[PDB]
Design a protein around this ligand. Structure first.
Ligand SMILES: C#CCNC(=O)[C@H](CNC(=O)[C@H](CNC(=O)CNC(=O)c1cccc(O)c1O)NC(=O)c1cccc(O)c1O)NC(=O)c1cccc(O)c1O
Ligand SMILES: [Fe+3]
Length: 259
């Protein structure tokens, strides 16, 4: 319904791309404010699990976002009859394991994070930019769960591509905490750069799908020490895993725009 609605200060259009290997099929839903762009272009919020993200974009939030500096919204979804792709998303959002690849939860191929982030840079942003003027210095990357895992991979291993990284309920349990090890060396990689990281977790979430909060608390404590990184952790009282997707997105979009 959001995508057909005509009564909001955003209009949505689709930008379609395939993966370079031809195996995954994307549809980017672009939400453009009716507002004219700043001279330097719209700030941009990129959302993983795009078809879920669009389901979470409520009318009240979207009206308020039209505040004179409204962002371009880019929801990166899968262009399939079901509007999901379990195999595709499992591959695109997970990092490669240097030492040994297959997902420890569902057994499907894993390790496409860097190919996905390269496609974002080298194919998605080129396509999106041609539809609306972008301010490349004011970009956000958001994701939930495996999407959060991808966001952390991006920040930890290739900082600087985005100004703000937003990871909701990132799957820290994945491969016995493998993402936590990717943080080593971040301060060095951040030299000469600045980044913001927003984190969420729900009070009712378990530690994994099969000690809750402890890994996140340790990660937050560690990142608070990183020069060049501004960190904001928001616990979500009263929510479990599924519900932090929409909560994080509403709260993200209520924050002041990236500087
Ligand atoms: C279909 C599809 C892809 N999306 C999801 O699975 C999302 C987001 N979660 C994830 O991407 C990962 C990875 N999971 C998957 O991609 C699909 N889930 C499973 O295969 C699964 C298997 C066993 C037990 C589970 O809880 C699973 O979700 N899950 C977790 O990090 C996780 C952490 C704490 C508690 C959880 O329940 C989590 O799922 N999960 C939810 O929205 C969710 C909603 C209600 C109940 C759930 O168990 C959910 O996982
Ligand atoms: Fe689950």
């Amino acid at each position: 319904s959001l995508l057909q609605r005509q009564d909001l200060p955003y209009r949505f259009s689709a930008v379609d791309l395939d993966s370079v290997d031809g195996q995954r099929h994307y549809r980017l839903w672009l939400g453009r404010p009716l507002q004219a762009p700043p001279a330097a272009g719209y700030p941009v919020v990129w959302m993983l699990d795009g078809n879920a993200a669009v389901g979470a974009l409520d009318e009240s939030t979207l009206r308020r976002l039209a505040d004179g500096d409204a962002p371009l919204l880019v929801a990166i979804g899968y262009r399939t009859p079901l509007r999901i792709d379990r195999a595709g998303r499992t591959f695109d959002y997970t990092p490669a394991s240097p030492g040994q690849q297959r997902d420890p939860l569902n057994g499907l191929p894993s390790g496409g994070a860097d190919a996905f982030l390269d496609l974002l840079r080298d194919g998605m942003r080129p396509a999106v930019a041609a539809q609306a003027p972008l301010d490349t210095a004011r970009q956000t990357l958001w994701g939930h769960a495996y999407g959060g895992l991808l966001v952390l991979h991006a920040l930890f291993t290739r900082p600087g591509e985005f100004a703000r990284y937003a990871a909701a309920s990132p799957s820290l349990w994945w491969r016995d905490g493998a993402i936590l090890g990717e943080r080593a060396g971040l301060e060095q990689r951040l030299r000469g750069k600045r980044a913001e990281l927003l984190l969420w977790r729900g009070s009712a979430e378990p530690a994994s799908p099969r000690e809750p909060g402890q890994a996140m608390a340790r990660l937050v404590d560690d990142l608070r020490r990183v020069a060049g990184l501004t960190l904001d952790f928001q616990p979500l009282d009263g929510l479990g895993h599924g519900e932090t997707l929409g909560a994080s997105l509403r709260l993200l979009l209520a924050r002041p725009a990236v500087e």
